[PDB]
Ligand binder design. Structure first.
Ligand SMILES: Nc1nc2c(ncn2[C@@H]2O[C@H](COP(=O)(O)OP(=O)(O)OP(=O)(O)O)[C@@H](O)[C@H]2O)c(=O)[nH]1
Ligand SMILES: Nc1nc2c(ncn2[C@@H]2O[C@H](COP(=O)(O)OP(=O)(O)O)[C@@H](O)[C@H]2O)c(=O)[nH]1
Ligand SMILES: [Mg+2]
Lengths: 430, 103, 430, 140
């Protein structure tokens, strides 16, 4: 019951899913052949959340994979746990977008999306009670940031009451791999605010910083960043698949973390994270988890959370632990940092406990906090956008496929209005 | 109780320079899911599913109390041992005085 | 020929119902399978040959807790189709569980209530348990109380609500639905007992000497209080008290029926037997402000009426000799228009111990239910918390979009202001 | 409340005013004897017995209980007299900082006299209205 379907688009989203599904399968004891080989009874009670049942007793994820080029899905199939995905759900084009948002949203993405919407509708109509959808995509690419966001609007138009999740990677100015990143980032943020019920920003720069400083491993690769993102993704829905002292589905988090409908851009972090050589030194206790949870360097975004004030915060503890300690520590982390918490909403931290810890760990915490410090990312994105747009650089590529500069002006104005009205509440006082 | 043996046992000291001699003689990371067996963090996969802080805490609490109880009996016994020696020594002193007088 | 029906709604309600139903089964000698290997009739019913069925119903929209109940050791006890379960949780939204999804479930619950009531011949009244700071709990409790008040009329209903702590909180939006539910049950419930978690945490820490308590330890104390309250209906006693003999002794006026409880003694077996536990010392401990079961200071207000239950080998003359001592003390003062304020009950059955629990076995115990003027502080602080966020209309869109009108928030505020004015008007001397 | 330091004449007036009040305990050191807030509650109760429940203020040596007594007095009593003590001034009083209590006593004296005058005017006005209504009902 109350299950969700997985939809991913683009190369970055496909690579994120290729590790997210591996993590989920390892958590539930599903072999790469789809056969259950788990140890505990609880591993099968709520498997309908992510997995479907077919004849022969094997399980198949309800994931939908879409891209405008076939290479990435032809590569993910040969990887481990690549056989679980149903071949029918693979939809792809023969041309690609070339990191051009217009091509992936107006000319090419519009004709292809009917086929993927057909299978999306097939998956949603069938399921017992829908909880919602979760979306993984990147804002630094053309086909992803175009087709995914248009699909968001199409899904929202047909299921207005369901919940919608988006895990979005925004292009940081530090590690830049594409010159046309500001254009399709700014165009995508315009559409994303209007339809997504929840959005979670993730930055490659913050992932590299975490890998270099906390884990202290010499050579980070995309596999480590994907693993961290996958652990963070799994931590959110853990209590929906396992029993606990205070169950809290996604809708309950939506109620408690979004004060106003347009303020739904969160930054997350996962604890504990320790190096291989120091994993024996540390002792896992609730104070040790909560001190690392609120650490500024532990956030999955380069945004500095002590440059603003938290509107609200959430924590999803895992493992068996006493609730009194959790509540007193949450109170203590809020009394010692009163300057960084907005004062006109008292008791702005939500907590939840799940009795099933991750495989290999005795305690774990997932942190989701809505803070005013996120304005800095939109500020720098808009700064680069307005630095590049004033000369109409690279504009002809977009304008040759039916798009105009008016949609750029409206997007810039709406993004600046969002930036302004997000900080409006930072200076608000009672 | 500071203590030394007889003169013969030390046998190093009659104008020793051995001590001087000794100085001359010297001239996609996967560590999250794979914490070390030694570490506190590692909970066995088989035991991953006991879900009750209640029962577990009660057994743990009982054990934490018991160590303190044995420790208390032992430290008190040490206290008793210094005092016993002093009581014995005073009694011994009287016996000894008595012994020399009889000699 | 005397019966009572207990209603459990929400996660907290079900988790305290489990706690009370181990205790009752243990106290009446019934095995977890429901089979005995004439006092049971108050809580149970005979099936003709063999097992006993509790006169209780479990309600929740979120299926996890009920599924946990239906697989534990008590799977054989409860009737299979009185554990009403939903599919979609209200997610801490009060408007959801009062207007959207609770209405489709409330009819089945009312049918079950009728089917249980037709069996009873001497129905004393109803008991209801619900944690107030949640969507489904508060909303469904309000709706059930409103339906029962008109279906049955003058039958007595008792509410063991758990209000949020002064500063410790698990959610961020619980003041809104707490205020709305207080509005709903102000004019619909005959008795309401205060049960916030912080006071019971302090009790456990100070007396039971547990530094890491969980919810089960709290629920066991609540279950003991319930058993002490209802012992007089199913055991022989020198001075009996019935449920219907409350509004004539503790409720001076129809509006004022919120009172706070206390229990004594609370002590562990490691140091219980070193002291004699006389009746005087336990009745002194029960009146200590630090042993209140709700985090309120009785020294800040007058007393109106005290109803306090004994059980064990206590003799009435020793009770009178201790009531005199309390009347003597200068730190406890009663209201002017109440010369005598004590109602005393004496029962012979000593409290029963649950194996593996915290409390030890004792021959004397005291449970007090006291109505005092100092309770207005919790209303004032909840009102202050509510006003801070209602000034900017925060989180209101999550309620307006679930069918509730805009003006519904204001009238709850007006009723709380009226209640606070009434409490001040009553406490002044003539 | 940034009140100027009191001169010696004003200090003597405050001490003579406080000595004119039959308090439950003999005064030896005003700065220490008022640090628990109990004596200020008694001082206000002498003039306004319905305004102050003196039994809510227990004698206190601990900072926590002194702070509870002062916060309770400030919110329930002083606020009704149309003034409040700042947290910093409460912290100075509980620590027996010189001149801290004397400044608060001066402000309390002035606010008490004003409060008593305003209560008298309300009674005189209410008595006038009641007398005027009785004269209209005698004609009916
Ligand atoms: N005393 C006690 N309080 C509890 C317990 N569980 C939850 N609560 C309280 O309940 C409040 C929230 O309501 P819940 O009972 O957890 O959830 P609910 O009533 O089912 O409402 P939903 O969130 O819509 O499911 C929290 O603030 C807790 O303080 C418990 O086991 N014992
Ligand atoms: N975490 C992670 N990020 C990736 C990976 N591959 C690419 N990216 C990011 O995705 C961005 C490029 O997106 P792109 O591949 O053009 O998306 P597309 O246009 O939808 O195919 C780069 O800035 C990378 O930082 C990966 O394997 N893991
Ligand atoms: Mg719930």
């Amino acid at each position: 019951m109350r299950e969700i379907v997985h939809i991913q688009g683009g190369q970055c989203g496909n690579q994120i899913g290729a590790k997210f599904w591996e993590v989920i399968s390892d958590e539930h004891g599903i072999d790469p052949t789809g056969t259950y080989h788990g140890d505990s009874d609880l591993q099968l009670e709520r498997i309908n959340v992510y997995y479907n049942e077919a004849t022969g007793g094997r399980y198949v994820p309800r994931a939908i994979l879409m891209d405008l080029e076939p290479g990435t899905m032809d590569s993910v199939r040969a990887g481990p746990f690549g056989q679980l995905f149903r071949p029918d759900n693979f939809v792809f084009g023969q041309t690609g977008a070339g990191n051009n948002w217009a091509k992936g949203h107006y000319t090419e993405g519009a004709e292809l999306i009917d086929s993927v919407l057909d299978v999306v509708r097939k998956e949603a109509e069938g399921c017992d009670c829908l909880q919602g959808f979760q979306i993984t995509h990147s804002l630094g690419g053309g086909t992803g940031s175009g087709m995914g966001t248009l699909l968001i609007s199409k899904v929202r138009e047909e299921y207005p009451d369901r919940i919608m999740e988006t895990f979005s990677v925004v292009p940081s100015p530090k590690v830049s791999d594409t010159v046309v990143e500001p254009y399709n980032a700014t165009l995508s943020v315009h559409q994303l605010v209007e339809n997504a019920d929840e959005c979670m920003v993730i930055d490659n720069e913050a992932l590299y910083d975490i890998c270099f400083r906390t884990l202290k491993l010499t050579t980070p690769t995309y596999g480590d960043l994907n693993h961290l993102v996958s652990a963070a993704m799994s931590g959110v829905t853990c209590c929906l698949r396992f029993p606990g002292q205070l169950n809290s589905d996604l809708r309950k988090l939506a109620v408690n973390l979004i004060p106003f409908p347009r303020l739904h851009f969160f930054m997350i972090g996962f604890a504990p994270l320790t190096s291989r050589g120091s994993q024996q030194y540390r002792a896992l206790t609730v104070p040790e988890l909560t001190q690392q949870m609120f650490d500024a360097k532990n956030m999955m975004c380069a945004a500095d959370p002590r440059h603003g004030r938290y509107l609200t915060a959430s924590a999803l503890f895992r493992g068996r632990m006493s609730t009194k300690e959790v509540d007193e520590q949450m109170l203590n982390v809020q009394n010692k940092n009163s300057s960084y918490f907005v004062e006109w909403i008292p008791n702005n931290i939500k907590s939840s406990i799940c009795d099933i810890p991750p495989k290999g760990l005795k305690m774990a915490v997932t942190f989701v906090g809505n803070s005013t410090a996120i304005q800095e990312m939109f500020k720098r994105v808009a700064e680069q956008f307005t630095a590049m747009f004033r000369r109409k650089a690279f504009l002809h590529w977009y304008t040759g496929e039916g798009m105009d500069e008016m949609e750029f002006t409206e997007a810039e104005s709406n993004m600046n209005d969002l930036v302004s009205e997000y900080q409006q509440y930072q200076d608000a006082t009672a | 109780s500071v203590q030394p043996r007889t003169r013969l046992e030390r046998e190093a000291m009659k104008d020793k320079e051995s001590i001087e001699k000794t100085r001359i003689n010297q001239r996609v990371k996967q560590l999250l899911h794979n914490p070390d067996p030694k570490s506190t963090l590692f909970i066995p996969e088989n035991q991953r599913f006991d879900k009750d802080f209640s029962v577990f805490d009660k057994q743990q609490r009982d054990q934490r109390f018991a160590t303190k109880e044995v420790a208390l009996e032992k430290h008190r016994i040490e206290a008793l041992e210094r005092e016993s020696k002093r009581w014995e020594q005073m009694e011994n002193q009287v016996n000894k005085e008595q012994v020399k007088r009889q000699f | 020929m005397r019966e009572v029906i207990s209603i459990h709604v929400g996660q907290g309600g079900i988790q305290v119902g489990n706690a009370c139903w181990e205790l009752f089964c243990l106290e009446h000698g019934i095995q977890p399978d429901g089979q005995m290997p004439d006092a049971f009739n108050t809580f149970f019913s005979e099936t003709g040959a063999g097992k006993h069925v509790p006169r209780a119903v479990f309600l929740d929209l979120e299926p996890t807790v009920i599924d946990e109940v239906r697989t534990g050791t008590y799977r054989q006890l409860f009737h299979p189709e009185q554990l009403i379960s939903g599919k979609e949780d209200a997610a801490n939204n009060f408007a959801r569980g009062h207007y959207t999804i609770g209405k489709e479930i409330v009819d089945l619950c009312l049918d079950r209530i009728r089917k249980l009531a037709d069996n009873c011949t001497g129905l004393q009244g109803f008991l209801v348990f619900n944690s107030v700071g949640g969507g489904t709990g508060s909303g469904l409790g309000s709706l059930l109380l409103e339906r029962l008040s008109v279906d049955y009329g003058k039958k007595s209903k008792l509410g063991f609500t758990i209000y949020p702590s002064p500063q410790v909180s698990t959610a961020v939006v619980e003041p809104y639905n707490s205020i709305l539910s207080t509005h709903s049950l102000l004019e619909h419930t005959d008795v309401a007992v205060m049960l916030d978690n912080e006071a019971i945490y302090d009790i456990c820490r100070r007396n039971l000497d547990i530094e890491r308590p969980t919810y089960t330890n709290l629920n066991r104390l609540i279950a003991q209080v319930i058993s002490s309250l209802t012992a007089s209906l199913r055991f022989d006693g020198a001075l009996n008290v019935d449920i219907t003999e409350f509004q004539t002794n503790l409720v001076p006026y129809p509006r004022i029926h919120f009172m706070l409880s206390s229990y004594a003694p609370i002590i562990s077996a490691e140091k219980a037997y070193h002291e004699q536990l006389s009746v005087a010392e336990i009745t002194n401990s029960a009146f200590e402000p630090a042993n209140m079961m709700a985090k309120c200071d009785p020294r800040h207000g007058k007393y109106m009426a005290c109803s306090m239950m004994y059980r064990g080998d206590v003799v009435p003359k020793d009770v009178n000799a201790s009531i005199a001592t309390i009347k003597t003390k200068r730190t406890i003062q009663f209201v002017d228009w109440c010369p005598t304020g004590f109602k005393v009950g004496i029962n012979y059955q000593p409290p029963t111990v649950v194996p593996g629990g915290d409390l030890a076995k004792v021959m004397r115990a005291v449970c007090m239910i006291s109505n005092s003027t100092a309770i207005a502080e919790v209303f004032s602080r909840l009102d202050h918390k509510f006003d801070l966020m209602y000034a900017k209309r925060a989180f209101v869109h999550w309620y307006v979009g679930e069918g509730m009108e805009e003006g519904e928030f204001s009238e709850a505020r007006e009723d709380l202001a009226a209640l606070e004015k009434d409490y001040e008007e009553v406490g002044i001397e003539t | 409340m940034d009140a100027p330091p009191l001169n010696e004449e004003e200090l003597n007036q405050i001490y003579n005013w406080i000595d004119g009040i039959p308090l439950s305990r003999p005064k030896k050191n005003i700065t220490r004897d008022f640090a628990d807030g109990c004596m200020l509650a008694e001082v206000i109760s002498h003039y306004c017995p319905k305004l102050v429940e003196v039994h809510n203020y227990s004698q206190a040596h601990s900072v926590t209980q002194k702070l509870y007594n002062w916060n309770t007095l400030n919110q329930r009593v002083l606020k009704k007299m149309g003034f409040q003590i700042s947290k910093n001034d409460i912290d100075c009083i509980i620590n027996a900082v010189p001149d801290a209590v004397e400044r608060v006593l001066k402000v309390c004296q002035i606010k008490l006299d004003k409060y008593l005058d305003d209560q008298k005017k309300k009674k005189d006005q209410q008595q006038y209205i009641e007398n005027a209504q009785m004269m209209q009902n005698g004609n009916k």
